[PDB]
A paper describes a structure:
Exo-β-mannosidases, hydrolysing non-reducing terminal β-d-mannopyranosidic linkages, are widely distributed carbohydrate-degrading enzymes. All of these exo-β-mannosidases process their substrate using a stereochemically retaining double displacement mechanism that is characterised by the formation of a covalent glycosyl enzyme intermediate (GEI). We show that these probes covalently label exo-β-mannosidases from GH families 2, 5, and 164. Structural studies of the resulting complexes support a canonical mechanism-based mode of action in which the active site nucleophile attacks the pseudoanomeric centre to form a stable ester linkage, mimicking the glycosyl enzyme intermediate.
No significant inhibition of BtMan2A could be detected following incubation with 1 or 2, but the enzyme was 85% inhibited by 3, again indicating performance enhancement attributable to the N-octylazido linker. The electron density for several aromatic residues lining the entrance to the active site pocket, notably W470, W533, and Y537 were extremely diffuse, hindering modelling and suggesting a high degree of mobility in the complex. The alkyl linker extends into a channel lined with these diffuse aromatic residues, possibly giving rise to similar, albeit more dynamic, hydrophobic interactions to those observed in the CmMan5A active site. Comparisons of the labelled enzyme structure to the previously determined structures of complexes with 2,4-dinitrophenyl 2-deoxy-2-fluoro-β-d-mannoside (2FMan, non-covalent/pre-catalytic) and noeuromycin, show that the ligand has migrated significantly away from the expected position of the GEI (ESI Fig. 3†). Reorientation of the catalytic nucleophile breaks the hydrogen bond with O2, allowing relaxation of the ring conformation. This makes space for a water molecule to interact with R393. Due to the interaction of these aromatic rings with the alkyl linker, we hypothesized that hydrophobic interactions related to the presence of the octyl linker drive this active site rearrangement. We thus conclude that there exists a more fundamental instability in the GEI structure of BtMan2A, possibly explaining earlier failures to trap it.
Author numbering: 28 to 864
The structure:
Amino acid sequence: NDTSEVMLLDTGWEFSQSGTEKWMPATVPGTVHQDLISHELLPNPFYGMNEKKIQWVENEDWEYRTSFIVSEEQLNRDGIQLIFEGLDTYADVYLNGSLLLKADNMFVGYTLPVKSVLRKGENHLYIYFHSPIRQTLPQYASNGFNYPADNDHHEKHLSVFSRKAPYSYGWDWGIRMVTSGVWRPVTLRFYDIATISDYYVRQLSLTDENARLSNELIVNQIVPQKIPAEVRVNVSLNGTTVTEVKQQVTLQPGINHITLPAEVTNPVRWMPNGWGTPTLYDFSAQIACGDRIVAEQSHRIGLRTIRVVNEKDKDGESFYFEVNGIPMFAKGANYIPQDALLPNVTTERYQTLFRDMKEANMNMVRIWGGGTYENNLFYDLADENGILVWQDFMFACTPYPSDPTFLKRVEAEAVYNIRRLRNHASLAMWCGNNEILEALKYWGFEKKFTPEVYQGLMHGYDKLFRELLPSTVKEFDSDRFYVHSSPYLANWGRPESWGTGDSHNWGVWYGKKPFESLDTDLPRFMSEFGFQSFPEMKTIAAFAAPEDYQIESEVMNAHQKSSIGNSLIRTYMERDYIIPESFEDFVYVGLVLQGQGMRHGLEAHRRNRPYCMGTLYWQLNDSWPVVSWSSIDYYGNWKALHYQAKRAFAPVLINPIQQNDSLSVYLISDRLDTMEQMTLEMKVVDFDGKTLGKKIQVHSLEVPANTSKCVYRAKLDGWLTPEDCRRSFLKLILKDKSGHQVAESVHFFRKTKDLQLPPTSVSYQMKQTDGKCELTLFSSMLAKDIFIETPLQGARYSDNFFDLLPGERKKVIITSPRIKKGEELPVNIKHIRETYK
Ligand SMILES: [Br-]
Ligand SMILES: [Br-]
Ligand SMILES: [Br-]
Ligand SMILES: [Br-]
Ligand SMILES: [Br-]
Ligand SMILES: [Br-]
Ligand SMILES: [Br-]
Ligand SMILES: [Cl-]
Ligand SMILES: [Cl-]
Ligand SMILES: [Cl-]
Ligand SMILES: [Cl-]
Ligand SMILES: [Cl-]
Ligand SMILES: [Cl-]
């Protein structure tokens, strides 16, 4: 609500491969690749072997153009700014014969004063995008060594020279699409007197009784006179004013700094997912000049404390988050770009992914440093879903340059994004990079370079990650934690270091260690651990013809970038499952495997609180159709791992853990309230539905807030025979004093491959309407790890990848806007015994 007028330059753009004099319609925001696809000038880059066929684009320059009209009335506004929220990457901006800007950083928004260049009538904007490959060949040639960036899929590692999304050059789950273009919106704003260049709501203090805020405004006045104004900040909640403050000023030409204190008595705090409401106040700053509101800016603000506790202690060095005074065990995942082509990621897709996180009970997401600083919508959704955000700076897995020019470019992206993000309730901490010091010290790299260059890399590390970035956080976001790297010291190979900070476990997967190692190999905080899976068949069909379905085939090694890939999946599967003959059935067990194995680790982490205070698995999501460590595939389909993470992160969890022919049962709660007079009930049930022995009852159980506690141990010997352990399972239920159920769990006493699973039909009734299909499933005998498979991309399930227990009916709701009444939903139910003879 101000007097400015904004024109979106988001239609009527054209592009041209440089020097062909051929122009065609473009979509802006967008990418060169998508503009080509859309005129059938590229094949589907995700389909089959098209990866090799699309690389040529990275070697060309690309130009974009648009025309707009400006009226005499508009040209008579005091000020007119052209805003680029993003240019990828080396971009020459020309308006009406003027070079406005030589852009050189994908991660920076540019605000350009243009009134003096604009013309009544037609106006011509041209943007020239230099190939970031050809732009940096001479830079590389001058360097006289290749930076060891193995995820840059090219002999010459040119990524490290450019402030560009690292993953664009490739990665061990990624396609190489080194694209260009106007990747975020272009707006022209026509205004009077000034704009608000920045609005920071700085929390000075927070108690139950009062919140103290400093409203800090930078106002850019574009007229040459002194202008009396009143600054106003309105604090509102759900449309109702809570407090109003104002301040007389006389704005000077150029930058003005304005500071207004405001207080909220009896503040309603922002809570993370699980602990209550993620309450957001509306803070609105207005600049009023007489009758007219010349500038306004708002932020949604959450009133909370977040402290990162990173202190020497008996165990080494703690690493945990205290939210509103309470240690909060972190439960979430590492997030990567949702697409090879970032502007194709829509509002719906961002909303669905946060629905996926919130429904799996997560309270944290790490924006890993080989992606982007996410758009404003991402942080807004993290705010309104109660997800803490761990923000890496966009450096990952290689040393980077540290020359003055390079540092100046990084300082600019750090100041831009810190100011862009520092008003979000969700933002919890900054991290300098992903695994750069680990890589410098341990991946070797030392053996690859002269000592001279090595020493240059080591001092270069300090200049960027221990000086420039920490000092910048201290200046612009002084109450947020910064750490130079994840992991900061813990090395997976060095068990003595595990008590010290966050860990990236590479024992599971790279080191081939069994999932069971995660019960003994305990970190203070798991920032990264993971396991691959092939995605389900409807997702393979999207990139592969039926001809092409094989475990180490051509396209199934092309769709794996890790190279050890498909082999590790078979090696791990054989330990716990019978390997099926059919590709389809192997795909299904592979989803089950990744699910069970990772859930086991996620449970170990919560079980070992307080020693361990969080787990973020690698990885939530995918950028394209591919074999990856994801829990959600590129089309939004939940793998078994997503259902399993949800189960393992449930606020109260019954965790039966069997080691050394003994069972222990823990009760784990992340609730803020302590539960009293609880009963654990267990009974041993055979795969036919017959109870073995008596129900076991443990009464008088306290479940204190934010603890893991053991409530029952029993040696297996004398309780069940080896034959029994292959033939039955443990059913566990937790109930309050009044016998109402608050949690259940199922426990198997042997590896699935060692189970005597009876042959069985899962039968179902199906009630199908618009958008919806309600299945009632039944099997008189145990059906293990059932997978209700439909060919409908993106279908959501109330539940899936669960055991259907003997005799016990189970309701499952499947939903999709594409479910039409009368076209019966194709449904194929798989279970483990079905996969071998
Ligand atoms: Br201007
Ligand atoms: Br400006
Ligand atoms: Br000032
Ligand atoms: Br955006
Ligand atoms: Br060298
Ligand atoms: Br530091
Ligand atoms: Br055992
Ligand atoms: Cl504070
Ligand atoms: Cl005043
Ligand atoms: Cl040397
Ligand atoms: Cl609960
Ligand atoms: Cl176990
Ligand atoms: Cl329940």
